[PDB]
Amino acid sequence: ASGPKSVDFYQFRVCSASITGELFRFNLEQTCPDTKDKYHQEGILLVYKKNIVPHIFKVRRYRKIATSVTVYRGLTESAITNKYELPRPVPLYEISHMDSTYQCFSSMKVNVNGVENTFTDRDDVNTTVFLQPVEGLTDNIQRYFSQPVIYAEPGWFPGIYRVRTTVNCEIVDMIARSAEPYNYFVTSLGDTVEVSPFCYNESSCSTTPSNKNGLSVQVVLNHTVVTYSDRGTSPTPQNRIFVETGAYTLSWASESKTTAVCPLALWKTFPRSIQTTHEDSFHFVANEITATFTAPLTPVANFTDTYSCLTSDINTTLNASKAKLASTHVPNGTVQYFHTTGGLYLVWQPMSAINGGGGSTDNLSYTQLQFAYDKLRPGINQVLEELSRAWCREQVRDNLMWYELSKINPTSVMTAIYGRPVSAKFVGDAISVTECINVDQSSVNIHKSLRTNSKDVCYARPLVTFKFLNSSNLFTGQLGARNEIILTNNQVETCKDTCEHYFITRNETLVYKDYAYLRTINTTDISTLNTFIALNLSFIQNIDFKAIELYSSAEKRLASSVFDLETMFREYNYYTHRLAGLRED
Amino acid sequence: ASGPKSVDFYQFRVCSASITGELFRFNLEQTCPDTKDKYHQEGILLVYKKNIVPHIFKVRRYRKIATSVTVYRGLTESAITNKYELPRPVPLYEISHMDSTYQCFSSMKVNVNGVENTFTDRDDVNTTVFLQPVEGLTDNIQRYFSQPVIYAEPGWFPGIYRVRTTVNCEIVDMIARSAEPYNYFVTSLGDTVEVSPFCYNESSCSTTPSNKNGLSVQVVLNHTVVTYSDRGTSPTPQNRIFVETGAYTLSWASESKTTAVCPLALWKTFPRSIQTTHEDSFHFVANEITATFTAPLTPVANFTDTYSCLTSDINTTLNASKAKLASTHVPNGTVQYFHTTGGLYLVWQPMSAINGGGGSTDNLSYTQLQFAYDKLRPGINQVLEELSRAWCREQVRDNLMWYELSKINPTSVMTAIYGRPVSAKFVGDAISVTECINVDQSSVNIHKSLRTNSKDVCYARPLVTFKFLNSSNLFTGQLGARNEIILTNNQVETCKDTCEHYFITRNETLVYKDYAYLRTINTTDISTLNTFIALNLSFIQNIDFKAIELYSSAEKRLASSVFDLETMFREYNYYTHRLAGLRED
């Protein structure tokens, strides 16, 4: 026969399983994979923020005030011409009684350029007097005075001046505060003190007085101070620091830096949370917040030596949390510490069923967006695994439908599983498969008649005459299948009174009736069955998100204070220099 | 026959539908479910923020200023030695003319410790004088003066001092402001007044003067004030409050708290929005913002009595919104009020087609994340419903393919629908199904030949000899199907010149040709057809989100003011106490 093997359904061809081809078998007894197993670890999670508030402590301020008024007796009239005020500090010989028993000496002495000035209340004798309270606006501040009334009696002889002078003792009790570098502190009344509040424990002080330009500093040991309930059951001794600036004395009780302040504070605690491991990081889940916190794969070393000041709090918080779960869970592993990109610190303790970034970010939105994405992702990936084993259990039945169809005739199954024409035959329980041979398009002609030379026999398919490539002798058969040449003839039972056919070729159809040919008609004129099932899936669609604000930048400005400092200081400078000042003309 | 029933395809067995087994029927005329119906309610949504700005009102301040300068005539030279200033309040006998006609009395009297001081401009006679404007830096502040020039003429006789004195009247017109507890207010020039701005309507005042330490307070009825356009068409009478602190008099017009301020403000309004009900909450949708607001299932009671001050605004806003939709929608139900976790208040009005949390959260990101999640979720759940009815319409056709295959032989369909060997037979329009019986593995032997004792008949399957368990007599048949024993023989039409077979057993294959046995070969040597269609689905993948900031914490600090208050007050204290002050040595 001819050389070229068939590769499409368009050329005329001769097929036969007449040779020892390749053998195939239906591989029955398949199975789909089983359901996977998935696991996770529970534990206690504690979350730490970096601290932000200033340090806050109580202080006392001691002063003596000298005042001088100039008055003019005049005649039938009198006036104040001036009033001057001079504050000064208080020495330790007096602070003793002034904080013990609320007494002071009604007079003062002031060295200036090496000469001694003196001031005495109402020009009377140096004598001891008692301090008493005065009313206040703000409940955290208390104030005590020795003499509420300024002296301005005009005097007895007409036409000349006199000077009137007074002395006060003052105590104030109030708050003071300071921030991260601890170089200085600021008092509630606005006094700025320029000494570190821990300075004795940093060994920057002594019982012998220290000195600086504009300061003297000392520590007094076993000092005692009495509350104005003024009662003999005196408070316990302390060590107290004393600062003697120009214009006042100030004092506070000594304390250590590492007991006073620690850099971190507890934000929240979750007694049930889960750890999952990814390619580059760990994820820790907090359901009550709707958030997840991530961290690098390596825990932070030395969190017992750096931040050692937390060792009071993590132990009691883990011990209380473990005692709450002790009926259902028991600890595993050991305590671990992690630092989140974003600036938070995590404490973790694994549980089993019993059966750096100093710029801490203020906005936590990325922790909630991670929780939403990690709830969508496994919810979608579970549908893909449930869809894929429902598909595989169908392909195991399709392979049995093709097996039962193959026992009827195996050729029509092989040219359905392959995309190309082949011929096939059973040789036992295995199927032998074989190539098919092309025949030339020009030797092929189809006969115009179907009734036989016998009186009552009719061909069910039209006769065809042909020859192979590179040959002279002719051959004949019947037009079979799509465009096949069949070598063995077949017939209808009788040439019954009426008959019709529409034989189909690759392009055209031949129409026959009364056992003879009539016309050639295009195949597209015959209507075609549709057996397909439509999906009509609708795809996800685009959204543009918007920038939104609850309060305007102006409303955020006006809410910050009732004071308008930007205009308050501009008017004070304009008034005191241009309007009210001495001015040339 | 033997007792044990077949449970796999590996042991040799005898099957027959020779007994009255159970009956089965193909249940034709199935259907898939129909498409569901889904519904939602439209309405108008108004959203309220808690208010944040201070209260703002106009005030007047009245003062008299006495000044005294000391000058020294000297000889061939002269200098100022001192300048002192004394502000005082203004009494009602003068405020009358001073706010009516812009006049004041050019002199003042000052009681101190029970004696009367007097100050007069340039030592001249007590006389009436007119106030006039002066220029200002800030456009909200106006200032008026009676005498712009301070007096410092040195005098005529050498070598002795003199005192020069002046008196001013001042008015200032300006803003003042106050915040949430309303205990006090602060003036634009920095004066703090320590009285509540509504105090007469709270019955904390009277027409008889009230008193406090450092204050006097009074209400004046039917008071009148004239604008500096100074024109006879005088403004309408008012009730005005007067405060007389040390150093000034201050006044403002009386007003009621419930007309002055209300705690909430309207943020946005949506004329088309949708309500959906979930297991624990309601969700309200705003498309123009790309956001959704949630609330508890119970509306807030008494929002007409608490927040009654909004009853002017919600009525006109709902009436305008309803009139905008009146061509396509008509109201249903009644107005309802809800409080969102996050601190916003919602107003809702249902429409039909015609056919607490005082910590208000500043960042609205959770409202946009809820809108994105509620756009993904129903978009994915719609694909699952469209995929599930496309699958069911295919299973209704697979059930018809198995029916048409069963009419050819029902055994091969029953052992495809069940996972196990059984035998089956039609008894009418119903199929009778029956168990199959195991035979021992040791009595089975397969014959080495296929040609019969007849001269031209050949067996299509090899002969087998066997016996049942607990028996002596032998039996024979043909090797059928996978590993079956068949009791009725079958043959090929003729012993044609050439023949070949590859019979398959559970492990091994037997090869025969020329109608006799030759070899045993492993089944895995025969190539197997693959008819499966691959899915190749690709799963969703992990993303790590990052912390991001547009401006540094330092840039947010430097943007807050041009004033550097942290260093401005430190230098003023250092200069006035250490550098410039009187200092001992």
Added chain:
Amino acid sequence: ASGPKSVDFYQFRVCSASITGELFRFNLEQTCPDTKDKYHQEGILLVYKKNIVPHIFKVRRYRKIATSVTVYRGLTESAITNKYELPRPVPLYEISHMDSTYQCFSSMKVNVNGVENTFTDRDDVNTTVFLQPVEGLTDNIQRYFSQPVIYAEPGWFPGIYRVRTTVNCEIVDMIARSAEPYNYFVTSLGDTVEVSPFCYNESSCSTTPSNKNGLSVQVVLNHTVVTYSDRGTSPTPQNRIFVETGAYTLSWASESKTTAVCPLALWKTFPRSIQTTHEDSFHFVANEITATFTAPLTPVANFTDTYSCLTSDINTTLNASKAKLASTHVPNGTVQYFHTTGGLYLVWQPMSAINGGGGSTDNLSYTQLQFAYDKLRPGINQVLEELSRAWCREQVRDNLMWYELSKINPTSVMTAIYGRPVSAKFVGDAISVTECINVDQSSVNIHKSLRTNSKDVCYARPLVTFKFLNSSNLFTGQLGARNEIILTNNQVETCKDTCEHYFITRNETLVYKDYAYLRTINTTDISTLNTFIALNLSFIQNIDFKAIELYSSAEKRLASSVFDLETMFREYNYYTHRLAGLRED
């Protein structure tokens, strides 16, 4: 025959392909669509923020201070009665030497109301003296003085006063700053200057002095200033501005507005980013941030003329970025500029493989939420395209299973592809299809027996007698299929000893055995096969997101300063007016 065509399987009917009906063909040689192609453009992206920091520059302040002290010699005692201070500006004849060589004239003259006052240090002669440094608290401020010590020696004769007077020269070197409208500037020590810092380049100044109420302003050309290293290699000349307010002289070096400040600053640069086009906008992607920025479809015009001050920076940044990619990419198109809703500006440069909104939003969360949504959406839409071509390749095999089943008998395939009974016949390679005819329910009766009048022939289906609508003559056949009447009879091979049947009708079943009828039984008593495969898909579920804060509104307040301005100014007003002031009684 009767008129009504069959529309269900419930009525009895007669079917035959006895007429020339419509022709159908199996449309083989189908294909599914091929895989789509998808494309995107890479480029360099630069992102610009609006600037927020104030302008910052160096200044000098020059002063002369006159002081006067009053002291009383007295007897056996002495005291200070007053101390007064008077600051004044410095004239250009002196600023020359004072900034060149650090010298000043130890005396001053002060015009007031047209008469000249004079002050001289310690009453000594007018002489030149040298300035020297003093220590400072804050490292950005330097201060120089001519006389550190105030003079207060009491004097020699008992019982009378004397006045002591001193003069200082002061220089201060420090920072000053100003903001967006540029109307004024504020010095580090709190001095507010009320002149624009660029005023000479805006032609608001001259070398002839300008004047305002309370100011004089001048520009000095080629001025020179010497650093206190005080060395003959003098710095280069400048043009310097001079302001002469009351109480001081102040100076700064002249500069142009367009070189000093530009409104925008570079935030980040991405050398690989991608542009995608949507229905109304463009999206630009930044992977290292996990964010995408959107913009309108039209680029902004005139960004080379408005914001021309950026032309130094975008050129060098694009040139450096292009040189980094020059081994793998080459430029295409040209540079384009876009303005994002949210207030950022984008610069874009396309690359190829070689082979307005002044309210800038501070919170970028919407840019990360867009990146998450645009990672979910194409990840889900890819699964729908991979699922849809896996479905289509199966429907192309189902169409071949129906073709092979149709060659056995075409009726049972046509009533599976249609939902209704029809009859069909092959007329060649095409199938002729025909309607079926209803018969009345009352003429139908089923015979009680199956054995024939012949001695050993039995009917496989029971006999039926019937007639057509509007007729008298009777007909007979066999009960076939579901509820069909068949006109041609068929039989079992022999009336074998035992036989049983369960014939099924639309409601009831008839049971027969020993070739005769016995009972009528409901069809539901016969057990039915189940061949369906379950999906068990589980749908996505609802989540309620929460409002979260890292720091309380109180902690955000307390972190803003160590100063408590809200109480500091309230106590100063209470103390100086009520407690310490002159008060009537």
